[PDB]
From a paper:
The interdomain interface contains mostly hydrophobic residues. These structural observations indicate that the TM domain of the prestin protomer adopts the typical inverted repeat transporter fold, which presently adopts an inward-open conformation. The amino-terminal ends of the symmetrically arranged unwound helices (TM3 and TM10) are oriented toward this site, creating an electrically favorable environment for capturing negatively charged substrates between the dipoles. In fact, we observed a density at this site, probably corresponding to the Cl− ion stabilized in this position by R399 and S396. It is likely that F137 contributes to confining the Cl− ion at the site. Notably, the coordination distance between the Cl− ion, and R399 found in our cryo-EM PresTS structure is 4.49 Å, which is longer than the typical coordination distances of Cl− ions found in Cl−-bound protein structures deposited in the PDB server. The result revealed that the contribution from the helix dipole moments is larger than that by R399 (details in the legend), explaining the large coordination distance of the Cl− ion in the cryo-EM structure and in the simulations. The Q97, N447, and E293 residues participate in hydrogen-bonding interactions between the gate and core domains (Cl−-bound PresTS), while this interdomain interaction collapses upon the transition toward the Cl−-occluded state as captured in the recent prestin structures. A pivotal hydrophobic interface formed by V499 and I500 (mutated to leucine in PresTS) is located at the C-terminus of the long TM14 helix and involved in the domain-swapped dimerization interface of prestin. We also observed strong densities of lipid acyl chains and cholesterols on the gate domains, further suggesting the importance of their stabilization.
Author numbering:
A (entry chain A), B (entry chain A): 58 to 155, 166 to 578, 637 to 722
């Protein structure tokens, strides 16, 4: 049935796969992306505090399970920088660095699996409850700001490995500040051989990237830069024996064999639930952003809810099979597309390359220095840092879009990354109220010899109709802007009906221009409860000083809510609702005439 | 100057005060409200965990300082139920109940003063920075929900005092649940004499309230119920000697003398900053709500910012002079108005009544049982509990207004009161995005023999113009709803321009109805950055399949932001902006004719 084929997209898109003009392309793309996943896999695993094999496990399992339940065709899932950074924060916070090393690593990976599990379950939940419309509310400025901030943290973290210092640091409030001054203090304790292999690594990386970009193809597959750099570095550090002689830190023992099946111990559920919620939201945001971009560019559509179910299932299975939360990335996805990726066959191919390295190659990466991994992370951070090109653009167009970007960026750098995201999302939602809370109110006049009405301050041509005052608000009337609307009505019509009633009563017990106000509700998108209360007030007041109030332009939903809210018994009838300002005006003049006689 | 008179309203409204038809009324109102403040002062002081004299200090100082800097004329400030409940939470959390008693009380009141100070400073800050428009965003359902929840907590807290049990409880997550089952467990440990004086207290209160309400005036001032009940109870508990014989808990020693000048020790600033922020926001919300209600009803206006400055100064001075955060209340304000309050002279009068009780009367309230105070609190909780009459009303009109009320109510009862308020405010802001995220899109037709255009599905009369497709969205085009807008455009116009371009290119390299789309932007309130990007996409796509796109109805601000965002160089010129759908249609038909030849 259509439900089972929509809950397993693989069973629908796989039979249709034409093996002649696609298979070659997807195999090229898969080999290119596998060659890129291995080094980064290990690197991002260090950045999350886990042992190095978890990167390989996270590069193997997730892409498979996604290929099965996933709707996007150009996304590459795996271990990505910012999710790695969040997992790292949690692990070293629940497990300080102080037999002992293996005990610490066992508790570390238990925390990692609990994180993966809870994040998977949250993503899966949101997907089943059809709440995948809430990923719309994660603004593009919000995620730009967020990922740029996180790239500042990731850059600072990998400075220490890059010199060879042994600085402890935090990800807590203002931690960046004392972390960089910690690095400025301990720069005389710089290992020189570590700095050497770091700069050698960067030189080899920039040579290979520039060379294979500008120079002639002579290759169906581009040159895997990170892989050959990792290979050359481990060979050098094994021959010249850097580890024991010069004291250069290396990657530990990488074990041979498939992942062991594990169980995330939920004893830690109340400690890590906060960071698991942050991991789930960041995963959704970046995975679905990428999917949507490539889908638009290649002329197809992804389902947000099925993407949440896919990503959720991916992380839960990974949780059992010794992984840490995977997510879509723009860098791998760009590489998977530019290589000639057409389907999730490319993901399956990449995962087979990581698989053969998990089984066979394995402990050849013993003598790999940690400085080469830190350099790889930095050259891949280019992407996220070039998003500072967005703060001027936003500035030029919309200052509230600029502020969302700035608040999230500063939130992330100069407080926690979880707190940064929370503050950013709040401010993001507030900016809608801030746009609608002082709307654009106008008094309309008729253009001479035409049956259209427009603003009198903006179109001096338009004349007010005698006896008839027409006022138009250009916004919803809800709790934020209802007091303002009533005030601006009483200011631009130049009548306060309660002051006028007070004057008239006072004069009569001691012994206005218009007879009809027409509210143009064409632009009133919606009303809430406070809006309806305010409208009842306005109509009752102007009834008391003897002024009929007509509504000209209400949409169906506003009339229905005014009807529910009891607008239609305090003097106003549904015979006072007109279709256009003109019809209201005509009826008003006609009533005035037939009531004169 | 006008600044000094606006920063001290007393210096402007006091000289004008006419001593003949007001002074008598304000003195009656002041005596009525002083008589009501004394008992409740003490009661609410117990509910906040402080010693009983702090209620009297908080009933004396704040009303004075408010009379000086305050803009409202019917508000009565003092110690109110919900602020008392928040202060209490903080105190017993930072100071558990375990010489010893006086040491604990000293640290308790130090915490209380720090709370008052920080809350005052936050209110003052918001007022100076002209951020008093943010008190608009605190919806009426949000505050109804919140105060009703808090009244459930306050009611449960005063059950234990009312029976005479010695149950410990919390205000933490789900604390209500195990707190009520704690009371159900310990009901066999009920003191009988305590329950006696509790029920005697309630009987005297309901007798005096009903009697002085229905029966003949024979009185310029109504009968102060709470005061005479406190007096009768202390006399009974002193003669019959309840305290030592039957073990009835009593109010401690109430000291004679003016408050001592104190200093809030800011060693506790990082412990109590959260709860001080909650106290400041709840104070603003309830004070300004009351001020606005009575101002509307009596035909004047209050300044939100000057109210924040007034309330801030009030709490800072109180902080120094041995008080805890005061706020406006609807109950006292109603009583101050119904008694014949005209100005803040009534507040000054009330504070003089509390003053003479601080100096002279004082330790006569030694033998006052705590059960009488708990009964007074419960009969004053009527107000807040009768707000359950709001959940049906909201339900009937607007389900999102109903959900704001429910989420805040449940947040407050079944989690923390601070967390309840935070969750409520979030959801409150989200409901604006939820209303605007799937707006009402339409395809418009011309009414026959009329130059107006309306929906074709809703008005079958209207016919589409040949060659011209008119589409109208009835919302802002921002990040929440921009993908939807593009989708609904491509669905209701029945053309996907990228699919059409693909078909045409494919056909040409192997070997639509309309020529003009008119976007009616009359109801587009605003655009953000993502909106402009989407609009550029739409225009570029329909340029590629050879369809001119005109904008008919953009307001000034949208055109300016489209101009900034670079909308006006990808094929569209400012010569494609029309004033009305009709003008666009005419121009489109004319261009088509003159281009045919
Ligand atoms: C009661 C509960 C309260 C509890 C507390 C909670 C309080 C919550 C907080 C709420 C406070 C937020 C209020 C914002 C009001 C909106 C006004 C607004 O922004 O419109 C813009 C002004 O803004 C700008 O353009 C400013 C940009 C510069 C700011 C920092 C630069 C630093 C550079 C780098 C230095 C780095 C570090 C420095 C930073 C420190 C002008 O807008 P516009 O041009 O007219 O166009 C758009 C139209 N609108 C939007 C205005 C309609
Ligand atoms: C664990 C529980 C967490 C619950 C959180 C609840 C959810 C959060 C809700 C968030 C709602 C909105 C809060 C964000 C306010 C933005 C401020 C702003 O406009 O400043 C802008 C940049 O300034 C910045 O750089 C801001 C940096 C971050 C913002 C801090 C806000 C306070 C919360 C931090 C909490 C600290 C906690 C301490 C440690 C725990 C510039 O100001 P501006 O005035 O717009 O400038 C233009 C001038 N005019 C003309 C417009 C006026
Ligand atoms: C990606 C990031 C995510 C991270 C996670 C964060 C997730 C954040 C969460 C977000 C989730 C919120 C989504 C809400 C969707 C809006 C739909 C909506 O409410 O419209 C209404 C349906 O709603 C109702 O009427 C329901 C009312 C009853 C509910 C409980 C009753 C209990 C009674 C007592 C029992 C007590 C206990 C029981 C309670 C347990 C229908 O609306 P309508 O009639 O058409 O009129 C208005 C029109 N609109 C508004 C619809 C346009
Ligand atoms: C200290 C740091 C704090 C930072 C917080 C950050 C800021 C918070 C941001 C708040 C943003 C929005 C969150 C509120 C979600 C409302 C849920 C909803 O719609 O349910 C409603 C009632 O259900 C209820 O009774 C809800 C009760 C409270 C809501 C809990 C939300 C999770 C946060 C709690 C945190 C727990 C923390 C644990 C302890 C610390 C009904 O659901 P519905 O689906 O609408 O029903 C109608 C059905 N359809 C048709 C509409 C579908
Ligand atoms: C996409 C890739 C190929 C870009 C080129 C990568 C190499 C050759 C170059 C360009 C990108 C560069 C990194 C980008 C980011 C930064 C941050 C900056 O504050 C210090 C230099 C540093 C750390 C750069 C070092 C050199 C670098 C790694
Ligand atoms: C310092 C951290 C917070 C990064 C934030 C950078 C912000 C504050 C800076 C970076 C570059 C800046 C822009 C650079 C260039 C111009 C062009 C000029 O004609 C108007 C100002 C404008 C548009 C600047 C506005 C502020 C800006 C966006
Ligand atoms: C405004 C005043 C005068 C109302 C009348 C007060 C007295 C006479 C009456 C009516 C209001 C009543 C209280 C209102 C609230 C509740 C909550 C309910 O679950 C149990 C009874 C209890 C605790 C009531 C006890 C009796 C009570 C105190
Ligand atoms: C139990 C706690 C959470 C209090 C919340 C009460 C809510 C869920 C209840 C209280 C009273 C109820 C209302 C009582 C009466 C009616 C009239 C009927 O024709 C339609 C339903 C309607 C409108 C009910 C809807 C739900 C309602 C508002
Ligand atoms: Cl990446
Ligand atoms: Cl009260």
């Amino acid at each position: 049935k259509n439900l089972l084929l929509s809950f397993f997209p693989i069973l629908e898109w796989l039979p249709k796969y034409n093996l002649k003009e696609w298979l070659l392309g997807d195999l090229i793309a898969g080999l290119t992306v596998g060659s890129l996943q291995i080094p980064q896999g290990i690197a991002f695993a260090l950045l999350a505090g886990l042992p190095p094999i978890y990167g390989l496990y996270s590069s193997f399992f997730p892409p498979l399970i996604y290929a099965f339940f996933g709707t996007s065709r150009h996304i590459s899932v795996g271990p990505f920088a910012v999710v790695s950074l969040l997992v790292g924060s949690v692990v070293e916070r629940l497990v300080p660095d102080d037999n002992g090393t293996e005990a610490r690593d066992a508790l570390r990976v238990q925390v990692a699996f609990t994180l993966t599990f809870l994040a998977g379950i949250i993503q899966l939940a949101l997907g089943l409850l059809r709440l995948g419309f809430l990923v719309d509310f994660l603004s593009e400025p919000l995620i730009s700001g967020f990922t740029t901030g996180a790239a500042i943290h990731i850059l600072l973290s990998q400075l220490k490995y890059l010199l060879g210092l042994k600085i402890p640091r935090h990800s807590g409030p203002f931690s960046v500040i004392y972390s960089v001054i910690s690095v400025f203090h301990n720069i005389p304790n710089t290992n020189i051989a570590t700095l050497g292999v770091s700069l050698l690594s960067f030189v080899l990386l920039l040579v290979v990237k520039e060379l294979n970009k500008r120079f002639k193809k002579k290759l169906p597959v581009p040159i895997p830069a990170e892989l050959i750099v990792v290979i050359l570095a481990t060979l050098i550090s094994y021959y010249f024996n850097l580890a024991e002689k010069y004291g250069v830190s290396i990657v530990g023992h990488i074990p041979k064999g498939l992942p062991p099946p594990s169980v995330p111990d939920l004893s830690l559920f109340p400690l890590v639930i906060g960071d698991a919620i942050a991991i789930a939201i960041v995963g959704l945001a970046v995975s679905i952003s990428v999917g949507k971009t490539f889908a638009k560019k290649h002329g197809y559509q992804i389902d947000g809810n099925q993407e949440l179910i896919a990503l959720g299932l991916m992380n839960i299975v990974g949780s059992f099979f010794s992984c840490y939360p995977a997510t879509g990335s723009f860098s791998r996805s760009a590489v998977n597309e530019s290589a000639g990726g057409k389907t999730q066959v490319a993901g399956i191919v990449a995962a087979l390359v990581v698989l053969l390295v998990l089984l066979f190659l394995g402990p050849l990466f013993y003598y790999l220095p940690k400085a080469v991994l830190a350099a790889i992370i930095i050259v891949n951070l280019k992407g996220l840092l070039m998003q500072f090109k967005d703060a001027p653009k936003l500035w030029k167009v919309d200052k509230l879009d600029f502020l969302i970007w700035l608040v999230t960026f500063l939130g992330v750098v100069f407080l926690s990354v979880e707190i940064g995201l929370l503050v950013g999302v709040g401010f993001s939602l507030l900016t809608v109220l801030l746009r609608t809370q002082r709307p654009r109110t106008s008094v309309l006049g008729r253009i001479p010899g035409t049956d259209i009405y427009r603003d009198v301050k903006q179109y001096p041509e338009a004349e007010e109709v005698p006896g008839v005052k027409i006022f138009r608000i250009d916004s919803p009337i809800y709790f934020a802007n209802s007091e303002y609307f009533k005030e601006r009505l009483k200011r631009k019509t130049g009548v306060d009906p309660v002051k006028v009633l007070a004057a008239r009563k006072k004069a009569l017990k001691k012994i206005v221009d218009f007879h009809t106000l027409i509210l143009d509700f064409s632009a009133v998108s919606f009303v809430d409860t406070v809006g309806v209360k305010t409208l009842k007030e306005i109509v009752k007041e102007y009834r008391e000083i003897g002024v009929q109030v007509y509504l000209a332009g209400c949409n169906a939903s506003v009339v229905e809510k005014l009807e529910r809210g009891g607008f239609f018994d305090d003097g106003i009838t549904k015979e006072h609702l007109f279709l256009s300002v003109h019809d209201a005006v005509l009826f008003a003049q006609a009533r005035k005439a037939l009531a004169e006689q």
